[PDB]
Amino acid sequence: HSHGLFKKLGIPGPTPLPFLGNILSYHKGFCMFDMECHKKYGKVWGFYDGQQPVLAITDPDMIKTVLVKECYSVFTNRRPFGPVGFMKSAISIAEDEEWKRLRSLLSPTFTSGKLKEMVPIIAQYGDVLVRNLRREAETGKPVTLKDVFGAYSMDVITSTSFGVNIDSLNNPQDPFDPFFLSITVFPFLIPILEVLNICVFPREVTNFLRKSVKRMKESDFLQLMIDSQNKALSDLELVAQSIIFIFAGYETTSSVLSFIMYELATHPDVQQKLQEEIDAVLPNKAPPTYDTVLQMEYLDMVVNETLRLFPIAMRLERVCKKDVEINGMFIPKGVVVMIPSYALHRDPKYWTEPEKFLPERFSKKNKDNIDPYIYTPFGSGPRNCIGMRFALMNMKLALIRVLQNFSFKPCKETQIPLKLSLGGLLQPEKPVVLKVESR
Amino acid sequence: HSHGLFKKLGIPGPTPLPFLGNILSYHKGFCMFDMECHKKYGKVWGFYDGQQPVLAITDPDMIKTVLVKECYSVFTNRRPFGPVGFMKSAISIAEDEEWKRLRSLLSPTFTSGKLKEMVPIIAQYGDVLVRNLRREAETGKPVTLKDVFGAYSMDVITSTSFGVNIDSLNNPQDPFDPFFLSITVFPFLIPILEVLNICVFPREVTNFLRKSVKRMKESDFLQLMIDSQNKALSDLELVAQSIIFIFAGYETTSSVLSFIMYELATHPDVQQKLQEEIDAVLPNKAPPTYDTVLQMEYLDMVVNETLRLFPIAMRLERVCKKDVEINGMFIPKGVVVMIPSYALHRDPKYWTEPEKFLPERFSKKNKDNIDPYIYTPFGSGPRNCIGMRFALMNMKLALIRVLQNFSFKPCKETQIPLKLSLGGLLQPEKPVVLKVESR
Ligand code: HEM
Ligand code: HEM
Ligand SMILES: CC(C)(C)OC(=O)N[C@H](CSC[C@@H](Nc1ccccc1)C(=O)NCc1cccnc1)Cc1ccccc1
Ligand SMILES: CC(C)(C)OC(=O)N[C@H](CSC[C@@H](Nc1ccccc1)C(=O)NCc1cccnc1)Cc1ccccc1
């Protein structure tokens, strides 16, 4: 390279192979690679995704500098992603000024008031979620959580943002490590693939929407995007935000729900202690409300501690858009700065027994011993997760309604312990199946 | 180029643009381009798909030389197709020796005896095809032919080759001009896309089968591929033939059926004259049989004359694998030789009133005035359509059973006349909808 950079900076790290960089080390997944490098190299280290240098940082102050103090000036954008096509205008993917604009356009969607307007609406699909669960529990047949969870998550996302109601067991649309591997050795092929219309998003899954958002409709977040469009928001740019929002609210929601239900099943005392709180705040199986959801502290602790063990983003990243010297360390233009959330969430130098599910970690007696720059399931700074309050609410409303009616036990075919997918993303190897018993 | 070749051979043709070749001329579709060049240039002409020279030939003798006399020696293979992936081992796509082998392996599937074994089996889905039609005709609601036709075509293909029965209105699997355009200017990008696993066949449609043929099953054409495997046939090569066969039997069958039913609807005398023959050969709505299907001469004439107007392959092609001088014309190595079937099927120098639907053209009084090297809906020579006798049978069995119960009239929203898709393939612009009346 270009494989001399960290050598030259005196920054330690795994020796890269030509072209490949360190990427063969991903044979155990991002997260094990990160954990290993943390323990081998300490607070800071560098590696190469192909020819791209990545600096991992683990100092809280330095992380606050990157995500917060110097965001607009230096660390505004994430690693180039391609080929994306018209999805370049998607907010999680857009850069500099354009992202600032979309962030401004879309921010007022998750105010405490717009959220609070959605609790009445969400309250309907929880009842479908239960009734669907009530059938596969009267029939003692183990249940695939992500199926009925994603169906619920799908139902919430299409109607909180657009207005479309579907009982996701008609199986309505749904979209979807062989190839992104070739990206990292061949990032030069991204501009190639762009001119080919080639997309990591199959052109058919997007064409299903390239009209279906125009096919919505029309005369909620979709409302809020024309009402704020009234330098304003295009319509192929509006479709792009819709795609982001539908994915995020479907996949992350369903998947974190599956993780929580696994933890409750292998820790029955935590499941019961939570069911008792729900019944004390919502007695007679009372319907949750925006304000009772926010009152349940143990539900929050359970949500948080699961997100400690399964930070589904895994890593946070920012591109260095110019030479800087943050907290005494020189960082050259073009380096990707990465925060290894999975690794920091499991660091024994911050967390007692860091692999155990222990929600007391987030008790108000203990929540202050926790550095918001070590615990980052939603990122931080101006580019943190815009859907955070919606996600926590949506999940908690789901959990409340579900633990109000059912208990969850392991099955013969439950994977205990749970292996993580040694692949690209943060999911289990085998899917989560548990016995569901009616209260 | 390389854009001097035809200039140098004294062969006439449209002047190519740099890089693009003649490809902007496709703005009206292959078929109009071919027809135009035929009338402008005569019997032989050349053009460039990007930098690739294509020689069109229209002399019957020369066409017989190419497709028949010199097939194994010179004109064994079709234009390189990519990126294909494991689909390179598919018979329509494979080359030289390997194609010879697969052609030998797979040929005995459509013997008159293996076909005859399938008439009993096919006879079941025709009855589903009718009963499905009987519902949308008791409800005077116009019908989309290709929907119920493809459902039938799907049902026939999965069970004639594997053994799987599905009432294709549960909507069972089904797989599927933006990008192949970039191929022709960038064929150099094909080896690029191969190393990227990138496929013109979405990796998910094939993964749905990359196991589903292994998921078939196992302890018919699928039978005949292990029984002949017993230099033998692999299993990822077996999947590849399955994919070819499922497509061909689904899409071509459904689409030619739609074309025939359009012609019968806009020519009611032909529809009646056919219904009379079916009732004379199969009286009391008798079930068709292998031998009665072959007896109906007007049904054959109707099938043939539709295939004259809609040759769904459009063009036949062979790569020149070495310098030759066929019928007095020198052809250099690497040129694609193309036979413009659509253009020859509509040549007024061979066909009276060539745009009219006139099935008498194929009467036994007139069928001999027709050059099998001008009329080529199934290609010709050792690389002709291997599924021809199956296709004609399958369609004719469908037509018999359907015209035995229903008549077909135009609708308010029937496109008359029918526009062809000015796009890539030979399909109508709008889909075919007709009124269906119960006899
Ligand atoms: C449990 C659920 C979720 C988790 C753990 C999560 C986590 C994250 C993380 C870690 C980031 C990157 C933050 C950073 O770089 O500092 C992010 C960004 C983002 N998230 Fe989420 N997320 C969740 C659900 C959602 C939902 C439901 C939406 C709804 C639209 C959403 C929308 C976004 C967007 C648009 C971004 C990019 C923000 C920007 O660049 O301005 N997320 N999320
Ligand atoms: C109305 C229906 C069909 C029409 C008009 C049609 C037409 C054609 C044509 C024009 C060719 C190229 C011949 C050449 O280059 O000389 C071809 C090849 C082929 N057809 Fe069909 N076809 C039909 C249905 C089918 C079906 C149902 C199958 C079932 C598997 C099939 C299998 C194939 C294969 C495998 C090839 C490549 C043959 C080889 O290279 O050895 N076709 N077809
Ligand atoms: C393993 C998971 C998936 C859990 O995580 C990731 O691997 N991470 C993503 C990789 S896909 C980029 C894009 N997906 C997309 C998906 C479909 C059609 C177009 C686009 C995205 O931005 N999605 C929003 C999001 C996802 C998750 C949480 N919240 C918000 C990168 C990313 C994550 C978070 C914020 C920004 C970017
Ligand atoms: C407009 C139409 C489609 C009617 O026609 C074409 O454009 N023609 C094809 C282009 S796709 C090559 C491949 N499809 C495929 C489709 C899906 C998964 C993998 C592969 C093929 O070979 N199919 C068999 C076939 C199709 C039609 C008739 N009979 C047999 C080229 C071709 C045609 C005929 C023989 C060989 C090659």
From Swiss-Prot, chains A, B:
PROSITE patterns: CYTOCHROME_P450 (PS00086). It is found in: Endoplasmic reticulum membrane; Microsome membrane. GO terms for molecular function: 1,8-cineole 2-exo-monooxygenase activity; 1-alpha,25-dihydroxyvitamin D3 23-hydroxylase activity; anandamide 11,12 epoxidase activity; anandamide 14,15 epoxidase activity; anandamide 8,9 epoxidase activity; caffeine oxidase activity; enzyme binding; estrogen 16-alpha-hydroxylase activity. Induction: By drugs, such as rifampicin. Heme binds at residue 385. Its cofactor is heme. It is an enzyme of class 1 (oxidoreductase). Belongs to the cytochrome P450 family. A cytochrome P450 monooxygenase involved in the metabolism of sterols, steroid hormones, retinoids and fatty acids. Mechanistically, uses molecular oxygen inserting one oxygen atom into a substrate, and reducing the second into a water molecule, with two electrons provided by NADPH via cytochrome P450 reductase (NADPH--hemoprotein reductase). Catalyzes the hydroxylation of carbon-hydrogen bonds. This is Cytochrome P450 3A4. It comes from Homo sapiens. The gene is CYP3A4.
